[PDB]
Design a protein around this nucleic acid. Structure first.
Lengths: 266, 422
RNA sequence: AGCAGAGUGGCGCAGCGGAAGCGUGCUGGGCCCAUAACCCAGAGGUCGAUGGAUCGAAACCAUCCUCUGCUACCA
């Protein structure tokens, strides 16, 4: 069924297709960036340079990024072109192609149980759920994946509008399985060069105080990579909440060790 | 623990691992392993237990027989006795010094804390070989004469060649003690006559008088690889010094001071140095726990110093005294000295070169090996029997003892003379 | 041992959320009187193990092992 918010493409929009035949006059191709509607590419507007081979360019069974040059709205002729394509558009379109595939796979679990004897089943599910998720956040550059990703980490998004059954478990499982494990790249940077012998116990007091105002029972990940370097991967959230945990903790270890003898790295 | 330190010094290409494993049973090993471009060029460590079945031969644990594995060309077998437990005679310690000429300053340092030696001669090269003489002379200067020459590589060397070599060495060294030192030819490819070596080292080398009552002094020569394992970091519960003690029974929990010191921040001169103080965590020797560390033995003293001082070999030739030791920490020093009339440690097949070296000139950098310390320093005043030297890093002078003085002849320093501090 | 890569389906390099990806080679065909250049065509097959989501996993994501690259120590 449709993979996109609108059924028909517009004018000058970047899309994706999959080649199913090669024509004399260009390439007649099916879309997989929308419905399986037909769109015709023309030979002239594929490149601005010569062309020796022809199967080392376009061939069957390839996703190809393209621009919709014209569309007949009533007839359903989607004129197409590969002449204006930049690699930056390919990154943006590959993401939207891949994200729609995963979102429609989530909106396939819904159809496994419900009445789907007719092809239009998924279309019924798509219009009513998809649009209110993505339309509210299309202007900021988000897909319906953002709405679902927000629901798993704070559940009020999918309870603000009609909640389905049995969907919720598989929805949670698939969001939490695929978009984790989930991750902190927090590493402490600490340098010490002691003349102390009481440094061994001094470091222990400093290590356990990586995060202030936490319980004595807080689990953390200590790492020793080299003798002066003390890496502490602090409490694992998303690395946008443990910023204060990373920054101010570094001051503790370097200060605690200077009080017991000599100068150290700051 | 240990009772005596026998050193295993010997010039290039005689094989160290075969002989060292036969005497101690503990491999000589160090950084870069790897193995060894030839023979060990690091300061190796090893201890061993010497027992008897009431026989001059020394057993293995399996004391019924011993079948070697030195070569599969033939089977070398020896018989120490038969089994029913063996009586412990003593615990011995070794000091494997560098076998290569460039490493002379290190060989000197390591040597200077031994109580006896084993000159490992190799029959492959020249008969009055440079390094044999170099070693021997240094040994008689430091205060030893408990030497057992060992002909360590005469496996394929014919009996005329090997006979001529022992003769020429013993005839060149006509002014250095060597006539009361035995010369034991051995095999190192079939480990033969090893049993008779065991008889020699208990005969020629008893325990010399050790002063327990006198104040502890530990001379550290080797650092420690502590720490960085797990679990619980960082840096360590600290740092281990491989040192021998030459005076005093160092007891566990005692505080010890490393006396060459660390120099004060923003010094405009050559003074001031401040000793570092560390409490003794543990007194480990062999593989057996101890509460004491008797003198005359090479012991691993774990102390409460932190990883940076032991992360590399940086504690070579440091003097440690318990605690607030009286020994002066000179930065500029008054050497009395004398020179050899030959250049020691160099002499090849053809007169080229080895003769009389010219007199020292002021503002030249020379290695003064004082104690086990190795510092570099420049000569500020040069009279024949009174030179004044200024040293880069301060030297703790335990006693006025001896010194060894070397001059940069070419690529590296070479031994020119000795003397005594005033 | 910290970090990185890989654990062939001809070779060599190993590409990404669709079951050989890229470059190359070998073999055959085409063009040409002929060769080169140029154009086409190939090939038994969980891609180290133990698991989860999945329609499916070298490849989507984990838990383990091994080999190496850089850094580097316990031994």
């Amino acid at each position: 069924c449709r993979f996109y918010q609108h059924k028909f493409p517009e004018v000058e929009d970047v899309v994706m297709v999959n080649v199913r035949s090669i024509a004399e006059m260009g390439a007649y191709v099916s879309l997989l960036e929308y419905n399986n509607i037909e769109g015709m590419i023309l030979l002239s507007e594929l490149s601005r340079r010569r062309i020796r081979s022809i199967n080392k360019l376009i061939r069957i069974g390839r996703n190809e990024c393209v621009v919709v040059i014209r569309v007949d709205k009533e007839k359903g002729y989607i004129d197409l072109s590969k002449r204006r394509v930049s690699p930056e558009e390919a990154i943006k379109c590959e993401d939207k192609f891949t994200k729609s595939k995963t979102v429609y796979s989530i909106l396939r679990h819904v159809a496994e149980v419900l009445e789907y004897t007719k092809d239009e089943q998924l279309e019924s599910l798509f219009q009513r759920t998809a649009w209110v998720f993505d339309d509210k956040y299309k202007r900021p550059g988000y897909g319906a994946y953002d709405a679902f990703k927000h629901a798993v980490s704070d559940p009020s998004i999918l309870d603000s509008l009609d909640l389905n059954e049995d969907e919720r478990e598989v929805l949670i499982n698939n969001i939490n399985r695929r978009l984790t494990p989930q991750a902190v790249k927090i590493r402490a940077d600490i340098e010490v060069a002691c003349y102390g012998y009481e440094g061994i116990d001094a470091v222990k007091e400093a290590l356990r105080a990586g995060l202030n105002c936490s319980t004595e029972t807080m689990p953390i990940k200590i790492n020793l990579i080299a003798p002066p370097r003390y890496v502490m991967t602090t409490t694992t959230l998303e690395r946008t909440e443990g910023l204060s945990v990373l920054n101010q903790a570094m001051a503790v270890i370097k200060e605690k060790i200077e009080e017991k003898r000599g100068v150290f790295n700051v | 623990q240990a009772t005596i330190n026998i050193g295993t010094i010997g010039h290039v290409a005689h094989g160290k691992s075969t002989v060292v494993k036969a005497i101690s049973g503990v491999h000589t090993v160090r950084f870069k392993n790897e193995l060894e471009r030839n023979i060990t060029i690091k300061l190796g460590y090893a201890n061993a237990k010497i027992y008897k079945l009431d026989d001059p031969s020394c057993p293995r644990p399996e004391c019924y027989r011993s079948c070697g594995s030195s070569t599969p060309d033939e089977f070398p077998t020896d018989i120490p006795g038969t089994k029913g437990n063996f009586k412990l005679v003593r615990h011995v310690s070794f000091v494997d010094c560098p076998g290569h000429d460039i490493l002379m300053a290190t060989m000197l340092n390591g040597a200077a804390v031994m109580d006896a030696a084993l000159l490992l001669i190799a029959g492959n090269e020249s008969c009055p070989q440079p390094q044999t003489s170099e070693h021997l002379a240094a040994i008689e200067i430091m205060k030893l004469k408990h030497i057992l020459i060992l002909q360590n590589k005469i496996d394929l060397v014919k009996e005329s060649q090997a006979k001529e070599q022992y003769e020429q060495i013993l005839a060149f060294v006509q002014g250095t003690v060597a006539e009361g030192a035995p010369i034991i030819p051995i095999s190192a490819q079939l480990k033969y006559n090893i049993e008779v070596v065991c008889e020699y080292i208990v005969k020629k080398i008893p325990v010399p008088p050790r002063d327990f009552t006198s104040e502890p002094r530990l001379i550290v020569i080797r650092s420690f690889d502590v720490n960085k394992p797990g679990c619980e970091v960082d840096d360590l519960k600290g740092g281990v010094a491989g040192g021998s003690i030459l005076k005093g029974v160092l007891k566990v929990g005692q505080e010890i001071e490393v006396r060459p010191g660390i120099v004060s921040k923003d010094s405009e001169g050559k003074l001031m140095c401040k000793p570092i103080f560390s409490k003794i965590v543990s007194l480990f020797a062999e593989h057996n726990d101890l509460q004491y560390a008797a003198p005359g033995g090479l012991i691993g003293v774990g102390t409460k110093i932190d990883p940076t001082l032991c992360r590399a070999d940086r504690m070579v030739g440091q003097v440690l005294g318990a605690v607030g030791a009286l020994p002066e920490i000179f930065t500029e020093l008054e050497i009395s000295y004398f020179l050899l009339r030959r250049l020691l440690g160099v002499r090849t097949e053809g007169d080229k070169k080895a003769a009389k070296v010219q007199k020292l000139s002021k503002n030249e950098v020379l290695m003064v090996n004082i104690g086990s310390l190795s510092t570099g320093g420049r000569v500020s005043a040069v009279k024949a029997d009174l030179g004044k030297i200024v040293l880069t890093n301060p030297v703790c002078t335990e006693v006025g003892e001896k010194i060894a003085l070397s001059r940069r002849v070419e690529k590296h320093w070479r031994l020119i003379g000795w003397g005594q501090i005033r």
